[PDB]
Design a protein around this nucleic acid. Sequence first.
RNA 1: AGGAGUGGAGCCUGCGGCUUAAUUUGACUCAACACGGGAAACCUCACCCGGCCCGGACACGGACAGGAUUGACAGAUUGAUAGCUCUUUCUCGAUUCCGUGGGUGGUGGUGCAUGGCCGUUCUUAGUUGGUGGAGCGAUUUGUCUGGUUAAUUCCGAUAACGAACGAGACUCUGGCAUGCUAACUAGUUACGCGACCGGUCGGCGUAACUUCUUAGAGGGACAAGUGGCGUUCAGCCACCCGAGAUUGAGCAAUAACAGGUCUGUGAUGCCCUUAGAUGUCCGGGGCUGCACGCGCGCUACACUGACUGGCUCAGCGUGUCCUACGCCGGCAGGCGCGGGUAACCCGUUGAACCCCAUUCGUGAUGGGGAUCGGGGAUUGCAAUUAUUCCCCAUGAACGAGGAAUUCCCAGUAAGUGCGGGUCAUAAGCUUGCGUUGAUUAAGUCCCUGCCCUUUGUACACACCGCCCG
Lengths: 30, 225, 95, 72
Amino acid sequence: LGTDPYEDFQENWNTKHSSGVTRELMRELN
Amino acid sequence: VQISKKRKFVADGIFKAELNEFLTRELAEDGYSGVEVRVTPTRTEIIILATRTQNVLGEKGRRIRELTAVVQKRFGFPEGSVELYAEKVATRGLCAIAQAESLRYKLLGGLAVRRACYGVLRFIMESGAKGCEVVVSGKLRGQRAKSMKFVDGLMIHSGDPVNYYVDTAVRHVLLRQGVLGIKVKIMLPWDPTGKIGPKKPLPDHVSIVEPKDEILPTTPISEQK
Amino acid sequence: MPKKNRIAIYELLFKEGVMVAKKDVHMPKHPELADKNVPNLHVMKAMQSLKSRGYVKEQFAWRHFYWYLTNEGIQYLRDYLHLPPEIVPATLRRS
Amino acid sequence: KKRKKKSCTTPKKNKHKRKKVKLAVLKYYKVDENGKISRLRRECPSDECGAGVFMASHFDRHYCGKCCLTYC
RNA sequence: AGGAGUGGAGCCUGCGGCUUAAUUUGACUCAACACGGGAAACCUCACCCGGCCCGGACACGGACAGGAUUGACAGAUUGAUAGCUCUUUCUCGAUUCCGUGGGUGGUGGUGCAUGGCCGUUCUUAGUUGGUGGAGCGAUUUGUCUGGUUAAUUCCGAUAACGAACGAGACUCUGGCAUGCUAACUAGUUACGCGACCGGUCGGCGUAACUUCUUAGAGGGACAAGUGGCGUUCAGCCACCCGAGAUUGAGCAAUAACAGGUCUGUGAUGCCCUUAGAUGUCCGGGGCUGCACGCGCGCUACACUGACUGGCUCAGCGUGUCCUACGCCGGCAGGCGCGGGUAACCCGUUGAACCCCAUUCGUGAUGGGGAUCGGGGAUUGCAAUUAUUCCCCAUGAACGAGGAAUUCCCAGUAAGUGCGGGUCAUAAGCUUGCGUUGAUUAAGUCCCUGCCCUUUGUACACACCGCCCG
Ligand SMILES: [Zn+2]
């Protein structure tokens, strides 16, 4: 029960933290 | 000296509106889902539908014996006239209130919104609902509020058939930064002659009976039974 | 708050496990405490005190307070009123 | 509107502080060495507080605090 | 094409302004302005001038039963019979009181921190997956050249095929049933008794039943029949029969707006204040003040009328304040008995326009009523900055309204009254109801606005753009 990388990326793909949310989602996927 | 019936039929709905509000603020975290009043001339019965039946009466029944005594003082019942009973909702997944309160105790406990809402839609659809919609509004990302909407299946919006084919619930959840609104709509299946769903079919659905296949005779035969 | 009023309020809540009042500070008499001349304000401000110590739990709805005794309230009012230990509130005696 | 802070009044009112009188029971009874006592305060003939409650010996009246009865 | 108008006048009510101690405040094109159920004497009430109370839980420390504290007559004081305060000396018995902490209540701030609700885009006809086809995939087709429809409603065409929401269907309501089930809290017919000159009787009592009244069930209308038009389909026009050949409303998509509401809430995050208070109560004021502008309206400008008499017809609603009956009053209005928690009583709801006689006779006139002076009566604790109502008296503008501009298609517009909400006292507002009842149209894209296809683009915060000097 932590944070969801999918939701994080979908909500912050165009903000300042896009480069970090992409990295976290890639870590979750692979 | 008694009262007019215009005022009597009204006063019986104001009484039932405040009792539901009082029980809502009291047994919500225990699965409260509705109340029913049966005015028997000897003993007024009040049935409370809930999920966790053990958390309503409590150990030794020390909680529903408190409710039946705090209710009669408020509403001026004579002692022993009013009795409160607790029962179980037949199906929890198709009650909008029980799902709009279940999702409130997941947003109040640290679940992500996106996964809290899919866990509710999945349980709603797996219980036999025909459609579901869950909306969450408020400050989910920063100082600006926004709405997330999760839909699944069929959902009707207009007409009279909406007054019995859908169940709606609106609830508030108080977080550290503000208030989030949770709306849950469930569209029930048909279930002819059934507890769940309306027995009436949808007003636009036409059911045509498939004829029984028969062989038309070629030659004449009399049957002299 | 006269000591007689304070005693009257405390030993009425003891028989039950519950208390009901209306949020009306100008009502001159509490209906359950008639013939003792105990105003409605005194009941409100006594249950305010007993709640802050943790001995009761409240619920408010539609201008009404509904208070319940907690296990620490029976233990505390038994010594305040010097009641025999063979006294138990009406909530605790059934089933 | 907008807050305007006007606190000016004829100075400030002072709340009546009661005077701490020590052993006021003494002056009600005069006790000699022979045991007999004299009651120096005149007493009110009422029912709510009779037989024990003394009145006020003012310069022109006798007054019971509890009864609010004044004899001139 | 027209009808009634608004915009002109008098006044009633809201907005600015200007005043003021305060004249509390939100909302400003459609999408503010008789809106906040917002018709405020007190309360409401936030605003202004003052004055009491704590209704400051709880924890810790102090003092204190050789008393912590509590309240109080009289003189003064005070707007006050506020022990509020000064003088004065009796009660009250740990409930309080003092410091520290951290709690509470706010119609206090932020609607650009939020929830919910509402308004709008939009009452338009729109919107979207799945599988397949095209492609550099950003995308695209489906979701369309064309007829048709109130309608992305259908027909058809067809690299698309199947679906979904919205539309439609659905619910309430109006019009029909001498067929069904029923009626002393609805009646009718008949027969008696009675009054009066076979007739009238809402005079009285019985039996026939359900036409009338009430309300349940089920029927009944589907472009169904005929004649035309239409790629003879989808449909459109006329007509017969028929109660009816479109009755009126409720609900209502995806996606949005920094739209309104923190002044509806024990909805709510922060910020502010919290004991000479932004809490709460009491007294008196203001919200209404008035040079001037801006919107909803109500009355008129008369003879297609006003006055005075007479005759004669509703529907929707309310009622433990709605009221019959009798007596005194010109009246507004007062006293005594009665009914009704209501198809039982007001009430068979004797409404107003309408209708029939009289007087008036084109005139600022008996039209029209503003304004103001005397009296009288009610509601309330209080009517003075007239609460409302009545009676004499007063008798202004106004002779049909510039540029502009609103609403409207048939029991409709307009006229005319009645009921509800507000309400101790109260409608020129709103929300419903009946009554009388039309002129003109059954078309178009000219004005206003919205939608669509093709086309151009140096725009993409999207023409209130970008950009050269
Ligand atoms: Zn005395």
